[PDB]
From a paper:
We did not detect native echovirus 18 virions that lacked pentamers at neutral pH. The electron density of the genomes is distributed uniformly in echovirus 18 virions at neutral pH, but transforms to a grainy appearance in activated particles at acidic pH. The inter-pentamer contacts of 11,000 Å2 in native echovirus 18 virion are reduced to 5400 Å2 in the activated particles. Correspondingly, the interaction between two pentamers in an activated particle of echovirus 18 is 25% weaker than that in a native virion. Comparing the cryo-EM images of native virions with activated particles of echovirus 18, as well as other enteroviruses, reveals that their genomic RNAs undergo conformational changes upon exposure to acidic pH.
Numbering used by the authors:
A (entry chain C), B (entry chain C): 1 to 238
C (entry chain D), D (entry chain D): 31 to 68
E (entry chain A), F (entry chain A): 7 to 76, 81 to 123, 130 to 277
G (entry chain B), H (entry chain B): 11 to 147, 151 to 260
The structure:
Amino acid sequence: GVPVLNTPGSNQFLTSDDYQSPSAMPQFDETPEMHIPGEVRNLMEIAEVDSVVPVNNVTGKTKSMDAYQIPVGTGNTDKTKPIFSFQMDPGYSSVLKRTLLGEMLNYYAHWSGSVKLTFLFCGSAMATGKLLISYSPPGASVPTSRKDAMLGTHIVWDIGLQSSCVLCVPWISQSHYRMVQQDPYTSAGYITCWYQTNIVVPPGAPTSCDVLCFASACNDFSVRLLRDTPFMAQPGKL
Amino acid sequence: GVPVLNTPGSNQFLTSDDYQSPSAMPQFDETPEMHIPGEVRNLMEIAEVDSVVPVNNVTGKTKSMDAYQIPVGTGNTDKTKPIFSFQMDPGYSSVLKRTLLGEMLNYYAHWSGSVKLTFLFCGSAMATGKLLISYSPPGASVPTSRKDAMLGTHIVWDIGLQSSCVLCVPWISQSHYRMVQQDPYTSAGYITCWYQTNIVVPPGAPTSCDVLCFASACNDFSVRLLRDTPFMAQPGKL
Amino acid sequence: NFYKDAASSASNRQDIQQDPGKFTDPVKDLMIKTLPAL
Amino acid sequence: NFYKDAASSASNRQDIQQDPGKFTDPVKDLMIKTLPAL
Amino acid sequence: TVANTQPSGPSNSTEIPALTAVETGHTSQVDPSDTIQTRHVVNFHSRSESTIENFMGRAACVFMDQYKINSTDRFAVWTINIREMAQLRRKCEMFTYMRFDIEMTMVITSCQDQDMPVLTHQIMYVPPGGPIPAKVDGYEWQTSTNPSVFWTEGNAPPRISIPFISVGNAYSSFYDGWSHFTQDGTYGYTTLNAMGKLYIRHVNRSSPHQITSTIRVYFKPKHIKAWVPRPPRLCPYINKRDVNFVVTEITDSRTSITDTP
Amino acid sequence: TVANTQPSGPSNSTEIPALTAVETGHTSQVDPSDTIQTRHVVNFHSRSESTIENFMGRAACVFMDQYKINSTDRFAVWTINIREMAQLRRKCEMFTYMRFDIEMTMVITSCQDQDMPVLTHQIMYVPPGGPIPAKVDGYEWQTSTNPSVFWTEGNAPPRISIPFISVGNAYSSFYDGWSHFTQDGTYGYTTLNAMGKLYIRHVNRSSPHQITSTIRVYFKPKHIKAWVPRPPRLCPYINKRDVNFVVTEITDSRTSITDTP
Amino acid sequence: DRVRSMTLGNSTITTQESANVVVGYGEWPSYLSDREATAEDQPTQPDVATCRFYTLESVQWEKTSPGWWWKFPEALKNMGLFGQNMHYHYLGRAGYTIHVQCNASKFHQGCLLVVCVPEAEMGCADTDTTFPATELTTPHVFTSDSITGKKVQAAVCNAGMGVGVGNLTIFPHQWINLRTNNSATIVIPYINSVPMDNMFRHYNFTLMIIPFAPLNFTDGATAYVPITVTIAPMYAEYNGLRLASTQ
Amino acid sequence: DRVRSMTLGNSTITTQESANVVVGYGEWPSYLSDREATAEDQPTQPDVATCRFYTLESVQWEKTSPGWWWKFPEALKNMGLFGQNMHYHYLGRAGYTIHVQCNASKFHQGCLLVVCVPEAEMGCADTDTTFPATELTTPHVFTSDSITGKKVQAAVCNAGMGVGVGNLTIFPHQWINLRTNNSATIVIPYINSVPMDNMFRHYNFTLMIIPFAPLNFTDGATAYVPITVTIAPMYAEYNGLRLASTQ
Ligand SMILES: CCCCCCCCCCCCCCCC(=O)O
Ligand SMILES: CCCCCCCCCCCCCCCC(=O)O
Ligand SMILES: Nc1nc2[nH]cnc2c(=O)[nH]1
Ligand SMILES: Nc1nc2[nH]cnc2c(=O)[nH]1
């Protein structure tokens, strides 16, 4: 018949291909389509949803509930010390690699866009305060004082009726994408929190409160290169 | 010539495929088409035809004619006991797996639609009666009294000149299809028969009559997933 | 159709026809669902 | 499309749709970015 | 698609859809819309996979036999019939008359009981009355007008299409009749089964060791027209040239008429 | 493409984009254009590879088992489920309900534990309730209405397409419910998993030496619709018929809340 | 619509309690058309000499009688001119109005299945031999047991052809329920894979009468309840004149 | 926009410090349409007898209480006519306005996660067995430890279904922050792979209430701070009448 020429790549099985294949069950009558609530068509729909961030994942608090809550107190000591501090890259950072942002990000090799950190204050209604949450791009060390941390993209968050604040990490990068894995060339900055003034509490209210942290993606967030997740780590037959 | 690429699935033999193949006998003059009466174009044409249901398939009556006839008598005893009772699913039920509905249904894995049970009364012309044939969807046990059975989709059938009645099982299912094999997730209900009043017979007529049962599909009946029948069970070379 | 012969063709699975009236009700006198049978 | 069956077809990778409004803000009363939440 | 269910309400009238007479040879055309109260539901269910073309249109095994390389066991012969194997027989013995043209697919697997070079097979079909070979160097094998397929191993299975080669307007699965006009001789469908023998051999002249090939023929009916449906077979398939049977129970038994699991 | 970043300037007003309330179940829709001063940048970045069709549309291994030539270890059986292997399970246990039709690709590699002639394999699929073979000369293997693939070695892997064969409007990865109506019997998604067994054997009758073939099935979902997203699995996959787990740390630990590398 | 009359070729049939006639597969029989014919010879069409009602020998229906079967066209040989045109012609068609009639009182009960099965290829009693032609063709009776020998396997559950006897409802059939009707009329068009066929060596259909509900009556009612079969070919035509065959 | 009222079938709900109601996945529940239905029987729609607020047993919230879960629809059995229509019908839908309410002072602190998880398939405490149905369904409590036995693994970090408990924010949920609101209302449309499903053997969703920030207060404040769940089905309809099931 028509003369054909077999090129390289014939009779192979590439797993990520787009070919038509003969149906095993011809003229099959599928079940009629029904409207189920909550259809997800893109995984960046479910990476842009908030998720509580285990910031206090110190040794002995991870397999508990105390990993999520950030201890914030009222006192005279250690008000020139950070409240927390962690890497901003949501893939390898030991704080936000497990969030919904970090779970959907570890199936990918490259990522772009702005992430935002939402801080819910879980104190009493009478306890008021102000906090400085700052982001500093890489190139220098971690900010060790509040003076060095207020030079980065920060926010002074007054705690009142609203009781929640969003720090949008503004995607200051050299390149268009960053590696999800940890490499020096594309490493995100640092997210530190500081006491702007203090937490002030009335005589009868509990003096030890805690901030609850969130993290999600913005509308310009995208992931770029599919890979397998390292978390599952199957040992053998189930 | 034209560069081609051999995809997976080449040089295989899928049994249920739709390909063109070279004719072994080219320019063959087939025998002219003739009109033979009774052309069947769909197997649900011949599953919607009635067929006598061996309801009385007790041990010792199956390899006989007494399997088809349902004993209905005139007496004072056992009028609060069912006349018959069986599973409604026509694939695995030991009563209607062999009917024409069940023979064409066992070539398939899924089935949908309403089945209907037709009851022919084979008594004398002077003997009259009333019967309650009920269908109860699953979720509860088998109805043990006529009070519990008249809560399902039932019919009170007066026996007279017409002498035949159709109980349409109305397809009350959770899903669009049910499994022909017996699984708990998609199991049909129960079909029980009861004495509404009694069978009343004149002095000279025979006091022991019997009801003859039928079963067929409705117009909304369909089968969905082709498989092999388990009945044939070839042992070896013929 | 890459062959001239008609037997050397794909199976016409697409068409769906049916006439169950020649099996379920082959009777001469028409029987109405509503009316009594006799 | 070289096959009649719809399951025997290429993956529709090209289409890109999304409705993140049913997950991020599923609230009844509309919440403006500018205004306070309560 | 199948018929939708029309909505009905409570009815009290002199019309009786449930009341029927089976003795009229008539199957009642009633729906659940006639007996009980129903809602309007739109049935998008189709009967596309219950048609005769989809039901019969799957390749079923019809013949297995061995033939050895390096006598009469050197090649195979089948004298074509559907009745060799039980599962496709029960589908074809479900219609009295049926008109179809089939393509056959062979699955030829050689097995060693010293290295086979490569095996090439010949599947020669002689129409009825043709010369039959009695040897592998028969002289019959040259196929001047017999259709024949040459196949070397390691390739796709040999598929060729066959027309409707029956003398009559349809193949007959059943023939309640005799062979001779005096009502004598062969009884049943064997008389009508005049389709030629099928001869399979290795075109390799010999082999250093004993190689036994087995062939598997897979008929798949297409362009199918079936007439006069009949009930499926209940009892098994003792013979190939006759519908003979041992009597079997019609259905699986229960302990009581009320007894149910 | 993704949304561009609009230019903003210094702002001093009674509007507060940063101030939110998480307790409203509401994720703030703010951008970096609301918190800080930004330049106008045109984002040509797309979300084309994060879609469900691109994410799930890669062929993942779902089944490996051996079957030998020359008993019940002569053929393989799988009773189809996604739960055999952990990596595709975590992608499918990420959505509660998901509706897709899959094509399966087999990778069949025979290995010797005297020369194999050539190996031809049969992958027969019985839908649920069909006859199961208990032997290689079962009689079940002839596939009158079961789908089946015949494959001889040295060719392209056998790829065939499968439709959406579920009873329900979607496959359910999770079923928080029981099998029986009395809340008894089998718990979990096992009750819903009614997809037939998959039978693989050598159609070669025998072999002079012991040959052990292994099969690798690769499902690739396509035409994918997914509903009700749920968080990815944290703890490992102890069983196949149930989501049972040993409790594990939520995240890797640090030494202090301020401690950072 | 219970009274009915059938008049064919000087022989009429009167019934007053009957179901309506059942037309086999919805086709009424007719003569062979010019486009579906195969024999270029002028066919013999004796419409009134052969297409008329022929009454077979009646059979006694008892409490334990299993059933009966006739094999047509052959059963109609040496009966009138319909059997004479078989012996002189090689080909033949017909359309067989089958009128099975069984009357009773209102104090008798029972239910017959009058079913016409095309190509009821029977089965031998011993599974490894073949049985003579006198076994197939006083109609042969079924048995409520298992026979052995050089005979047709005439068990009732497997109706002779090896199927479920309750599944014989797929064929054109009626029921004689003694409370409703006392007759069953089935019209059978010419059903065969061939336009004309020989009437001796080939049995186009068999008539099976099987009591699903057996006959029952108390003392005093008439014990002799006979079943009479009245078969009338329709649109019968013949081709291939020759010397008479001796059978 | 903090005050709100919900009136269903003669039962209204008043709240004065609350977030706005969260509609699960942006779909408000409704009756089953004619094109997406599967059962051709007229469904029972008792809109005022069943679609009303039912108040479950309140639970005490302590400084060390891990959490609670209910399993609906089943938790609403034998409660009003919504539970009676379960026992007599085989199928069912609803839309479950869930109003979780927990009040405190301005001197109490704490933060609950009120999350509705569809198909919260739990995990057994011992990884090789199966646990009875009384384990799943006084709401079952989580534990801030690891239990062992024939029980559901009710650790809090793995919320029972074996995920990160901070990642339960993907589901329709609210927070009860005691400084902001004292109630959380979630509306859940009928979420299932099937148009109607049985309400006994199948748990469409579970209601998990998990304190991320624990309850804390000094001496003098009220120690007994209860959490009350007020669930009201919406657009509930039933199909498949039968005898009452004994469960
Ligand atoms: C190498 C050439 C091969 C040609 C093989 C020709 C096959 C003949 C056609 C098959 C016979 C089908 C008979 C069916 C009869 C029935 O349905 O009972
Ligand atoms: C040789 C023929 C092969 C045919 C194989 C049929 C495969 C059945 C379909 C795969 C089942 C998919 C189940 C997914 C359920 C889930 O997502 O939890
Ligand atoms: N008398 C009569 N002639 C026909 N010709 C075609 N159909 C019929 C029929 O039903 N009755
Ligand atoms: N009352 C009310 N009815 C609806 N119907 C559709 N959406 C809505 C809603 O949000 N509120």
